[PDB]
From a paper:
Single-stranded DNA (ssDNA)-binding proteins (SSBs) play crucial roles in DNA replication, repair, recombination, and replication fork restart in both prokaryotes and eukaryotes.
Four monomers of KpSSB per asymmetric unit were present. β6 strands function by clamping two neighboring subunits together in a tetrameric [name]. The amino acids 120–174 in the structure of KpSSB were not observed, suggesting that the C-terminal region in KpSSB was dynamic, similar to that in EcSSB. Many hydrogen bonds and salt bridges were formed at the dimer–dimer interface of KpSSB. As compared with the crystal structures of the EcSSB- and Pseudomonas aeruginosa [name] (PaSSB)–ssDNA complex, we found that a GGRQ motif occurs at residues 114, which might be a regulatory switch for SSBn or ssDNA binding. In the structure of KpSSB, the GGRQ motif interacted with Asn14, Lys74, and Gln77 via several hydrogen bonds. These GGRQ motif-interacting residues (Asn14, Lys74, and Gln77) in KpSSB, perfectly conserved in EcSSB and PaSSB, are ssDNA-binding residues in EcSSB- and PaSSB–ssDNA complexes.
Residue numbers in the entry:
A (entry chain D): 3 to 43, 50 to 92, 95 to 105, 107 to 114
B (entry chain C): 3 to 24, 27 to 44, 47 to 113
C (entry chain B): 3 to 40, 50 to 92, 94 to 119
D (entry chain A): 3 to 114
Write the structure that this text describes.
């Protein structure tokens, strides 16, 4: 493998985790994570799209709710999709990655 | 300051850095990282392209010394910004932004 | 600079932060932070904070507090009553932070 | 599994890696890694340099890869965790060593 692609997030879920099961039986979870920065000339929030697979996805479905504080270690992935044109979404994907609930 | 938003990358510039002066400098370039896995059986490979943006001294350093193919270490944060393109379509871009608490190191 | 020296910790304070003032007047906080892998084994990390963050730690942190630490490794040499001793600490530098995560361990 | 214990290093080997094989059969490698930072004292204006030497330990394939390809002065990327281990020395002194340990879930990457 060439280079390093690593994301570390701590923040709060903006909604309940959505868990879907793949025909194979592999769990997949999605949720958004808020991080913010406040400074004096001000507050700016960043919303991260997190994707979890397998057991970690199942853990998210059991235990995570809107407002839950989690730690995320994942990788950046930009994927192309089209809808009713070309759209691109950059996600934080947990594959070597971990998820830990902090409350 | 509320939560943690941290990106760490090691990779190679996909082109020469674009440097513009505002007085603070702003530089941008793309970074390739790749993972290689073996098929279930051939050595396969996928590259990920990251959009990096630098501000101040780091941007100026990038313009001086970085070129297409340079290997760098980046520590920054994620920012998704919205723009409408000239067709009226709302578009979003996620970039890796290196401000003060971030670094860039040439390897 | 030359190379990268980065430690990232999430865990719980082993004791109350010890805050002392240096001759210079700068604040310094010291405490231990526990991390564990599960068979279960605990790693105790020696954390050192300086200035405003150290005072913040003394005000608001207690034994059992969950914190996030971003710092760097420093091994410092000190002699005992006369053998040479070394301690490796996680020191929160310019580019580092400490963030209170809320919640606390019990007994 | 409880909390987070992560070290990230980029630096240069201070020696060739020593690779011993355990009786179990798994390889173990160790070497020291130098990281340095340079800054100008904001109060005094002086230029300052400080080097930090890290003790790295690798297991399994990475240990073997290190023995094959890494040498003194090689630039590597390390991701691992901190471990402090206790030992009494032949003089009877309790001693402590903090190492950067790369197990499963860590990586070692040759740079350049």
């Amino acid at each position: 493998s060439r280079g390093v692609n690593k994301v570390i997030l701590v923040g709060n879920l903006g909604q309940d985790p959505e868990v879907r099961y793949m025909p194979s039986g592999g769990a997949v979870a999605n949720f958004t994570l808020a991080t913010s920065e406040s400074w004096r000339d001000k507050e700016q929030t960043e919303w991260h799209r997190v994707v979890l697979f397998g057991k970690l996805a199942e853990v998210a479905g059991e235990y995570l709710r809107k407002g839950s504080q989690v730690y995320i270690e994942g990788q950046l992935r930009t994927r192309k999709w089209t809808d009713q044109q070309d759209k691109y979404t950059t996600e934080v994907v947990v594959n070597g990655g971990t998820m830990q609930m902090l409350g």
